[PDB]
């Protein structure tokens, strides 16, 4: 009859008459839609360039609901002014469950900061040849040759978590600290109900990254509903302009992919392409979004149906989803990166041996129950 073959416990390559292939190994190499809701496509932007509101990532400001976030590997435009990002990899874990925004102003410019000027632009964040700055942050400078102290509160009326973002400037000279902020011993104190931190600038000459020898360290927090955050500074404050009322979702995530964007409909999605199948398992990628087959590190997995010519128990028990690309951890987190890669590769090898042995067990019981009735009849 046919030429399909199965593998068994003792013998392999058994020529049989019928088989069901439990592996979907193919995919359309594009980023199709998830149900009808289009994903978020950062393009040449980082996660850090998207929430800080890079001047070259203005086309993503308008989009506030998505199916998943698509980041490109080695993304060029993000954090245009050089500096640290305090708990950047922790914030990507927060934004891997957020399914909706509400980009609003906490401290509205032209009404919120009197006695200061909000026109602070840098040549590292230049947009269309002219120097610009972030779309969600304000660089406060002097007004009438004076930088007085500031104070602003914000009570969370939004009935949701509010992600507040700010930054502290770290200059390169002491003649530049006096020229902008007119004080040499400055501070930033951002307090809340369950948050309190005080920042102090560090004036030092750095290697030139994007042309600047000074740094801006970016910070964040998560306001609770009904809670108050109080900003207070003597200088060196890159002040919050916009923020986000966070709406949490269950099926979402950040994938890293170079696939072209198409207009499809799908049910599953991997960084190599979407999957349209009803088969139980897959070989494409462990990182899936949507209702998807289960990942096994196999190439040949068939269950025999008929005689030879001379599985829900595993799918119910996997229940784990892998999100690791290599962007999840830090320079100074390698004992936790090697622990995450031990756990992820350990569950991908237990559940591959479990799925293969159940096929090997069911193949010998099928071939001898079929060869039971040949001698009854």
């Amino acid at each position: 009859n046919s030429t399909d073959t199965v593998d068994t416990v003792l013998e392999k390559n058994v020529t049989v008459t019928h088989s069901v292939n439990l592996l979907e190994d193919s995919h359309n190499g594009k980023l199709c839609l998830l149900k009808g809701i289009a994903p978020l496509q950062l393009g040449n932007c980082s996660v850090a360039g998207w929430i800080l509101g890079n001047p070259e990532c203005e086309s993503l400001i308008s989009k506030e609901s998505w199916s998943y976030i698509v980041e490109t590997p080695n993304p060029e435009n993000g954090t245009c002014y050089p500096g640290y990002f305090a708990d950047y990899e922790e914030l990507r874990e927060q934004l891997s469950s957020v399914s909706s925004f509400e980009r609003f102003e906490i401290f509205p410019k032209e009404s919120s900061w009197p006695k200061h000027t909000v026109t602070g632009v840098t040549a590292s964040c230049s947009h269309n040849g002219k120097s610009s700055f972030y779309r969600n942050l304000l660089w406060l400078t002097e007004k009438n040759g004076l930088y007085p102290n500031l104070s602003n509160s914000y009570v969370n009326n939004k009935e949701k978590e509010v992600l507040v973002l700010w930054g502290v400037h770290h200059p390169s000279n002491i003649g530049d600290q006096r020229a902008i902020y007119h004080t040499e011993n400055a501070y930033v104190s951002v307090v809340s109900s369950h948050y309190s931190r005080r920042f102090t600038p560090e004036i030092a000459k750095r290697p030139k990254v994007r042309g600047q020898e000074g740094r801006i360290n970016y910070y964040w927090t998560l306001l609770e509903p009904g809670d108050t955050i109080i900003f207070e500074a003597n200088g060196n404050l890159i002040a919050p302009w916009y923020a986000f009322a966070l709406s949490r979702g269950f099926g979402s995530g950040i994938i890293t992919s170079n696939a072209p964007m198409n207009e499809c409909d799908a049910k599953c999605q991997t960084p190599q392409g979407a999957i349209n199948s009803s088969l139980p398992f897959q070989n494409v990628h462990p990182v899936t979004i949507g209702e998807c087959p289960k990942y096994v590190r196999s190439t040949k997995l068939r269950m025999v149906t008929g005689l030879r010519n001379i599985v829900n128990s595993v799918i119910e028990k996997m229940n784990t989803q892998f999100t690791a690309v290599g962007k999840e951890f830090n320079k100074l987190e390698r004992r936790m990166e090697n622990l995450n890669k031990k756990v992820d590769d350990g569950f991908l090898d237990i559940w591959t041996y479990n799925a293969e042995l159940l096929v090997l067990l069911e193949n010998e019981r099928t071939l001898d129950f079929h060869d039971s009735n040949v001698k009854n009849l």
Epitope: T122, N128, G129, K130, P171, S172
Partner: antibody, heavy 116, light 111 residues
Framework: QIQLVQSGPELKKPGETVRISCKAS????????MNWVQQAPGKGLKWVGW????????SYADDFKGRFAFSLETSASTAYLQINNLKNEDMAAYFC??????????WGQGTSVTVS | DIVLTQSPASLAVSLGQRATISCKAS??????????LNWYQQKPGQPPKLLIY???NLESGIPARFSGSGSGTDFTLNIHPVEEEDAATYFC?????????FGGGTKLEIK
């Protein structure tokens, strides 16, 4: 190679309107802005304003607010400057220039607008 | 508006001299250690040509005899050795605050 060619010289009467063109080529029209510099012979250069080619948002100086108005045609690479309407002042040359690094590096051939 | 005053009005220079063209702004044209002062050269009957951008970097395509320096409000343009093809008018232009403002000009006539 980068080039900005303009329209020819114009001769108007004080009371009607003129429209200057600036056909860019050799580079992507968006990702670079477009200045407009007024050279009046005998007075020196003056900055009319700047138009964002990606956004479309103009920004004028206050001495050029109200009459001078920039426009775009990004389907091709062409920027426009319309004056509404010409006095016997602003009888000058008009250069269109390009923003690269807060500067005007590639200029136009000049559009001699004479008001008679 | 930041008003910039060229100095001198126009300078007499022979071939092999050192021509110093200077302009002094009313306010400061730097922010975070980036001087926003550009230098332009205009031969008559031609558009101006960018030589030095902000405020010491030399643009590609310009001969290396041009060099400018300065910080804060005081900037100079120094030309040596002065070849004969530099018979033009020299402008300085700020890019710090809108609107952008040019100089008055300075003719470099060669003996």
């Amino acid at each position: 190679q980068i080039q900005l060619v303009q329209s020819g010289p114009e001769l108007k009467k004080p009371g009607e309107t003129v429209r200057i063109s600036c056909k860019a080529s050799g580079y992507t029209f968006t990702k670079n802005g477009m200045n407009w510099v007024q050279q009046a012979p005998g007075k020196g250069l003056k900055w009319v304003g700047w138009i964002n080619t990606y956004t479309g948002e103009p920004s004028y100086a206050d001495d050029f607010k109200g009459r001078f108005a920039f426009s775009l045609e990004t389907s091709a690479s062409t920027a426009y400057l319309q004056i509404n309407n010409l006095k016997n002042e602003d009888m000058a040359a008009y250069f269109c220039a390009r923003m690269v690094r807060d500067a005007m590096d590639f200029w136009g051939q000049g559009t001699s607008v004479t008001v008679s | 508006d930041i008003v910039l005053t060229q100095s001198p009005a126009s300078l007499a220079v022979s071939l092999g001299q050192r021509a110093t063209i200077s302009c002094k702004a009313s306010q400061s044209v730097d922010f975070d250690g980036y001087n926003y002062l550009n230098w332009y050269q205009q031969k008559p009957g031609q558009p101006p040509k960018l030589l030095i951008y902000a405020a010491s970097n030399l643009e590609s395509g310009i001969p290396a005899r041009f060099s400018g320096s300065g910080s804060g409000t005081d900037f100079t343009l120094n030309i040596h050795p002065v070849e004969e093809e530099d018979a033009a008018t020299y402008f300085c232009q700020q890019s710090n605050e809108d609107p952008y403002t040019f100089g008055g000009g300075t003719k470099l006539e060669i003996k």
